[PDB]
Amino acid sequence: GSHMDSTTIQQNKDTLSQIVVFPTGNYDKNEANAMVNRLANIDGKYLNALKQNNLKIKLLSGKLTDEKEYAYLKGVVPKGWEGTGKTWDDVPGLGGSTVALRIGFSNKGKGHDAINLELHETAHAIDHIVLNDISKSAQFKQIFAKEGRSLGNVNYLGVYPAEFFAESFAYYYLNQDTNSKLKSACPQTYSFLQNLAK
């Protein structure tokens, strides 16, 4: 329960080798590997479900909107970003039906507000592809009504249950510190995530 983590990592990295796609061009290989390592903390059942659905986690060597598949987002303002002067050209990751992540932009504040980019975006894909939009469920709505402001960002996370779901998931899986902070701040959300993975 603490003594065999190497096996869980081995399995999840094997799964991730069948999900993660590295980009053409030049980028920091050690940082890309660090992102894969952090994703390996996510429960294997979710990662294997993404793999079954042929979801690829595309790591990017440049801006999101410079990829052909996301060019339609050039100049477009993300929800909740009205009034900022910023657009998707400035945003380093996206998740949902697909996952795309700029290498080097994991940490909070690297163009985004999540505790970790790759876990937040992948959580969106798990919500949508694996869990049938569980962030829209009546069960989660009740939890969100109570706890959805308690990770901060009250006018964004506290208003959009899919974002609160993705941020809570990132806290649950990033490290022991964030996991404990979620348990303290958002106990029903923590229990909800613990039971999903049982």
Q: Which residues are catalytic?
A: 121
> Quick one: which of 57, 52, 54, 53 has its CA closest to 36?
57
Choose the one of Zn ion, Ni ion, none that binds residue 3, judging by a C-beta under 5 to 8 angstroms depending on kind.
Ni ion
Tokens 């050039």, residue?
A: 74
Please state the closest distance from residue 4 (CB atom) to Ni ion, in A: 5
Site for Zn ion in 156-175 (CB under 5 A): 163, 166
Choose the one of Zn ion, Ni ion, none that binds residue 198, judging by a C-beta under 5 to 8 angstroms depending on kind.
none
Choose the one of Ni ion, Zn ion, none that binds residue 85, judging by a C-beta under 5 to 8 angstroms depending on kind.
none
Residues of this chain that bind Ni ion (CB under 5 A): 1-4
**Is 112 a known ligand-binding residue?**
no
Question: What count of residues does the chain have?
Answer: 198
Q: Which is nearer to Ni ion, 2 or 24 (CB)?
A: 2
Q: What share of the chain is helix, strand, coil (3-state, %, to 5)?
A: 55, 10, 40
**Is 69 a known ligand-binding residue?**
no
Please state the closest distance from residue 163 (CB atom) to Zn ion, in A: 5
> Within 10 A of 164 (CB to CB), how many other CB atoms are there?
25
Q: Which is nearer to Ni ion, 7 or 54 (CB)?
A: 7
Please state the closest distance from residue 120 (CB atom) to Zn ion, in A: 6
Residues comprising the binding site for Zn(2+)?
A: 120, 124, 156, 163
| Site residues (vs Zn ion, CB under 5 A) | 163, 166
